[PDB]
C-alpha cells in the first residue's frame, strides 16, 4: 500500500487515521499542530522527509511509527530529512527500528522534555552527521539518559546506545544490512530482513524496487519514478501534474519519469511522452484562453512577458501610455511566431513597431474578415514599421491593409511585402496613397556637418546653412544627441512626441547674420564617451505642398576628450603574514579613458607617541591593536500556514586590481594610497588617491626575552 504523493495531517488528532493502511509513504509527511493511542506498525519507509511540529500529547515517536526503518529523503525540507521542532510532551525519539537515512540531515529543536539524544549514534543511521542541528532540547545534564546492550565511540566518548527506556539501538555485526539477530541481508537490501539475503524479503530496498525485488537499475521496459521504485510506460501515461492552464502529463527521459522535461529539453510533437533536445534557448509558448489578446495598455502586455511563440491573435490598441518602446520590448521583444493575425488599430503612441524584434513569422490560422493577417488602421504617429533592412519577416497566409496612417511613408510598406512575400496578394484599396503618407516626409534633403570641437565635457558642432526649397518657408533646427556605447543606433527609439527614452533634443535657431553658420554647444557631458548626434530641420511651409521635403543629417559619432580618472572604489586590505599586505579594490566609477595600470603607494606610519609615556602597571586595561535559528522558523512558518481564499614607496600594478606588498616591518601601521591612471594620464596626470590603513601581522616570538 503506497500513499502519496504527500501526506499533511494537522489540526484534528483523529485525522492521523489516514495512515492505517500505508506501509510506504510516497513523498513527505506532516504531523503539525496536533492536540489517545494510535499505532501504525504498517509504515516502514518514507521517501522524502518527515516533519513534526507542535504535537501535544505525544510522548514518543515509537507510539506512532514503531517499524519506521528508512527515511530516504529524496526531497528535503530545507536540507533536512527529519524535523522535530517545538514538540511538547515528547520524551524520546522512539524510532527504535530506524536504520538508514539516505540523504539529508536532522534538525531536532525546542523540545524541553526530549531525552535520549546523545544515546543515539547518528553516525551509523545517516551520513552527513556534521550538518545536523540538535539545539534547544532538554539538556543531557538535566535529563537522565538511562538504558534498561552494545556501545561504541560517540565523539570522543564511549557509552551505551539506546533509543528509549525499553528498546536499545540495534546494530549489525562487523561481518556484514542484517536481520533481527546476526545474519547479513542481501546487498541490495536496506534496514531489516524478513528473511536473510533475499530480494523478496526486504523491509526497504536500496537503489530501486520493482515487483517485490530490490533491483539495482530498473528493468528494460520500466523507468525511474520518484526515487525508490520503477514503473512501466503506461503508468506515467496516466499521471497528471499539478493543475494549471499549461498542465500536461509526465515525461519519460533518461530512463526516468519526471514531471517536466529538464532544462535544455522540450516535449516532442505527437509522441508527447519523450523529450527532444532543443539546441537553442527552448521556447516558452504562451497560450491564452481569449481568442484575440488586446494590448490596450502596458499592463495588458505584461502577460506576454518572455513568450517565444504566441498561440493566438495580437490586437494592439495603445492610445496613451508611459515609456512604451522600452517597455513592450521587455515583454513582447521575445515573441518570434504569431499563429494568427496582428492588428495595430488606434495605436497613436506607437511611432515604430520595433518592440516586436524577434518576430520573424506570422502564420494565419485565423484572419480578419477579408483574409487579412496584418491590419493597421488610424495610427496618427506611426512613422515607421519594424521593417528596416536588418529584420526578417514572413507572413504565410493573409493580406495586408494600411489606412489612415499619415506619418507612415507609403514606400516603407512596399518594402515590407518584399520580405513579407505578399507583393501581388493585396487589392488596390488595401494600400492607398490618399490617407497614408499624408503628413509623411519621405524624400528629404541632407544636412551636412561642417566642424566639430571636443573637450572633456563640451562639444561644439556646426552644420551648413540650409536654404528651404521654398522662399517663404520658416526654417529652424533641432539637435538630437544621446550617449551611444556603440554605433548600432536607430533614429526611432521613443514613443509618440513624448518619448524621452533616449535622444536629447535642443532647438537652435538659424543665426541672423548669414556669414555665421548654425551650431550648438553641448554642456555637461561624460569625459571619454561616444555621443550620437544628428540635426533635423524644422521647415514650416506656408504653402502646404504635399510634396513634403524636409532636411535630415547623418548620424555623427563624437567622443569627448579624456580627463583625470576617478578614485579607485572600495579599497580593502588584509595581512596574511608578517612583512606582507594584500590589497584589493574595484575599478573607478568614471574611468574617463582606457584603463592602463594602477599606482599604489604605502607609507610607514609611526607608532603612537602617547603610548610611550604612561605607566601601564597602574592602568587596568592595556591597549591592544589588531592586524589585517530565526531564519529556519521563518521558513517553517512560511510553508505550514497557508491562508484560505616616513618615505613613500611606489609601485605600478599592470593589469589586475589586486597586489601584495612585500618587505614590511611586522606589526606596523601602513597608509595605502591607490591611484588609477589611464592612457592619457601621461599628460593629464593620474587620478587622486582612495587610501586605507592596515597593520601587518605580528612577528611571532619576537616580543619575548632574548636571553637568560
Amino acid at each position, epitope marked *: 500500500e503506497i500513499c*502519496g504523493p504527500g501526506i499533511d495531517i494537522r489540526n484534528d488528532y483523529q485525522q492521523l487515521k489516514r495512515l492505517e493502511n500505508c506501509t510506504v509513504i510516497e513523498g513527505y509527511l506532516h504531523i503539525l499542530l496536533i492536540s489517545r493511542s494510535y499505532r501504525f506498525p504498517k509504515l516502514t519507509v518514507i521517501t522524502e522527509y518527515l516533519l513534526l511540529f507542535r504535537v501535544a500529547g505525544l510522548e514518543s515517536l515509537g507510539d506512532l511509527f514503531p517499524n519506521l526503518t528508512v527515511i530516504r529523503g529524496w526531497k528535503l525540507f530545507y536540507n533536512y530529512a527529519l524535523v522535530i521542532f517545538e514538540m511538547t510532551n515528547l520524551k524520546d525519539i522512539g524510532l527504535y527500528n530506524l536504520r538508514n537515512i539516505t540523504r539529508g540531515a536532522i534538525r531536532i529543536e525546542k523540545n524541553a522534555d526530549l531525552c535520549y539524544l546523545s544515546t543515539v549514534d547518528w553516525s551509523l543511521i545517516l551520513d552527513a552527521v556534521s550538518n545536523n542541528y540538535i539545539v534547544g532540547n532538554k539538556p543531557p545534564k538535566e535529563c537522565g539518559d538511562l538504558c534498561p546492550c552494545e556501545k561504541t565511540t560517540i565523539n570522543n566518548e564511549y557509552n551505551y546506545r539506546c533509543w528509549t527506556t525499553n528498546r536499545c539501538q540495534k546494530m549489525c555485526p562487523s561481518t556484514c544490512a542484517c536481520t533481527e539477530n546476526n545474519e547479513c541481508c542481501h546487498p541490495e537490501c536496506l534496514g531489516s530482513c524478513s528473511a536473510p539475503d533475499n530480494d523478496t524479503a526486504c523491509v526497504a530496498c536500496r537503489h530501486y524496487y520493482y515487483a517485490g525485488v530490490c533491483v539495482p537499475a530498473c528493468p528494460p521496459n520500466t523507468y525511474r519514478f520518484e526515487g525508490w521504485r520503477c514503473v512501466d510506460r*503506461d503508468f506515467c*501515461a*496516466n499521471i*497528471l*501534474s*499539478a*493543475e494549471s492552464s499549461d498542465s*500536461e*502529463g509526465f515525461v519519460i527521459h533518461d530512463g526516468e519519469c519526471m514531471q517536466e522535461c529538464p532544462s535544455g529539453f522540450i516535449r516532442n510533437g505527437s509522441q508527447s511522452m519523450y523529450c527532444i533536445p532543443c539546441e537553442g534557448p527552448c521556447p516558452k509558448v504562451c497560450e491564452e484562453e481569449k481568442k484575440t489578446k488586446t494590448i490596450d495598455s502596458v499592463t495588458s502586455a505584461q502577460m506576454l512577458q518572455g513568450c517565444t511563440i504566441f498561440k493566438g491573435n495580437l490586437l494592439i490598441n495603445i492610445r496613451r501610455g508611459n515609456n512604451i518602446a522600452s517597455e513592450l520590448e521587455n515583454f513582447m521583444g521575445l515573441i518570434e511566431v504569431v499563429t494568427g493575425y496582428v492588428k495595430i488599430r488606434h495605436s497613436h503612441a506607437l511611432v515604430s513597431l520595433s518592440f516586436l524584434k524577434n518576430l520573424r513569422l506570422i502564420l494565419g490560422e485565423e484572419q480578419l474578415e477579408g483574409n487579412y493577417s496584418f491590419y493597421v488602421l488610424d495610427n496618427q504617429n506611426l512613422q515607421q514599421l519594424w521593417d528596416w533592412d536588418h529584420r526578417n519577416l514572413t507572413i504565410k497566409a493573409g493580406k495586408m491593409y494600411f489606412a489612415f496612417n499619415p506619418k507612415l511613408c507609403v514606400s516603407e510598406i512596399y518594402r515590407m511585402e518584399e520580405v513579407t512575400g505578399t507583393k501581388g496578394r493585396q487589392s488596390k484599396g488595401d494600400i492607398n496613397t490618399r490617407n497614408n503618407g499624408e503628413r509623411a516626409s519621405c524624400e528629404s534633403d541632407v544636412l551636412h556637418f561642417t566642424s566639430t570641437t571636443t573637450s572633456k565635457n563640451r562639444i561644439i558642432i556646426t552644420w551648413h546653412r540650409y536654404r528651404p526649397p521654398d522662399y517663404r518657408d520658416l526654417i529652424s533646427f533641432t539637435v538630437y544627441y544621446k550617449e551611444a556605447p556603440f554605433k548600432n543606433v536607430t533614429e526611432y527609439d521613443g514613443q509618440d512626441a513624448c518619448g524621452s527614452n533616449s535622444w536629447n533634443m535642443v532647438d537652435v535657431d538659424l543665426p541672423p547674420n548669414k556669414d555665421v553658420e548654425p551650431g550648438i554647444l553641448l554642456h555637461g557631458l561624460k569625459p571619454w564617451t561616444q555621443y550620437a548626434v544628428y540635426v533635423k530641420a524644422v521647415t514650416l511651409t506656408m504653402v502646404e505642398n504635399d510634396h513634403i521635403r524636409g532636411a535630415k543629417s547623418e548620424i555623427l559619432y563624437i567622443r569627448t576628450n579624456a580627463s583625470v580618472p576617478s578614485i579607485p572604489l572600495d579599497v580593502l586590505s588584509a595581512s596574511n603574514s608578517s612583512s606582507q599586505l594584500i590589497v584589493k579594490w574595484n575599478p573607478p566609477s568614471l574611468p574617463n579613458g582606457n584603463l592602463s595600470y594602477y599606482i599604489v603607494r604605502w607609507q610607514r606610519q609611526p607608532q603612537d607617541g602617547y603610548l610611550y609615556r604612561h605607566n601601564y602597571c597602574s592602568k587596568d586595561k592595556i591597549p591592544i591593536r589588531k592586524y589585517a535559528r530565526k531564519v529556519f522558523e521563518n521558513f517553517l512558518h512560511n510553508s505550514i500556514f497557508v491562508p484560505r481564499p616616513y618615505p613613500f614607496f611606489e609601485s605600478r600594478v599592470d593589469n589586475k586590481e589586486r597586489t601584495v606588498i612585500s618587505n614590511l616591518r611586522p606589526f606596523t601601521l601602513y597608509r595605502i594610497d591607490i591611484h588609477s591612471c589611464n592612457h592619457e594620464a601621461e599628460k593629464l596626470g593620474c587620478s587622486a588617491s582612495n587610501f586605507v590603513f592596515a597593520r601587518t601581522m605580528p612577528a611571532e616570538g619576537a616580543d619575548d626575552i632574548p636571553g637568560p
Partner: antibody
Amino acid sequence: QVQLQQSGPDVVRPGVSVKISCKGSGYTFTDYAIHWVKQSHAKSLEWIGVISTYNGNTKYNQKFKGKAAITVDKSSSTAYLELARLTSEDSAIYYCASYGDLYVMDYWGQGTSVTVSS
Amino acid sequence: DIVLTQSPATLSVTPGDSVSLSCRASQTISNNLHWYQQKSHESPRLLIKYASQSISGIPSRFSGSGSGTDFTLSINSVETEDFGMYFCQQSNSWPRTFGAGTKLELK
C-alpha cells in the same frame, strides 16, 4: 475483469447541481486516469476532462471548465463529475472512461442519462 | 482546437461486404487517432489504437491506416454485429476531440 459502473439516470430542474459516480473494479484504480465524455446527441462526442487517480490533479476542456468539476475517491475507487447551473443544453449522456491513459480511452462506463426538465 | 471530419455520414451496407471509413483532421497528426465502435443503446468500445495498431479483443476484420491528416478504418468482412456508429478520436494535443460519427446502417 475491468468494469466501470456509473450512477443511475437523473432528471432535475434547471439551475441545480448534480454529480455522477463511477466505481472501478477489476483493475488497480490508482494506476489509471479517468476520463469523462459528454454525448448530447448521437453525433457529438465531447471530451470534458481527465482526472489522475494517483495525485488527484485534473485537466479540463475549456468549454467545460466553469461548468464541470471532476473529483476522485481513492479508498472508494470512485470518481465524480459535478455539474452546476444545469441548463437544457447539458441534458446529455455522460460516460466514464478509464483503463487507458491520457491518450486513449480503452474501457467506458455504461453511461448516465441526465435530463433537464422544465 | 482541432476538428475531426468523418467523410461518409451514413453507409448502407449489407453483411459480407467490405467497407472503408474516413476521418480527416484540420491540423497535422502523425498518429494519435483512435477509433471507437458504439452500437445502439451501449457505450463506445475502442477498436484501433494510434491509427494502426489493434487491440486484443476486437476481431481481425477491423484495420486502421493513414498518417498525418488522412486516416482510414477498414472493415474487411462486415458482419451482422458490426452495424452501428463509429468515431475517431484525436489525441495529439489538447483538448481531445471526436469525429461527427459514421452510421453503418443496413442496406
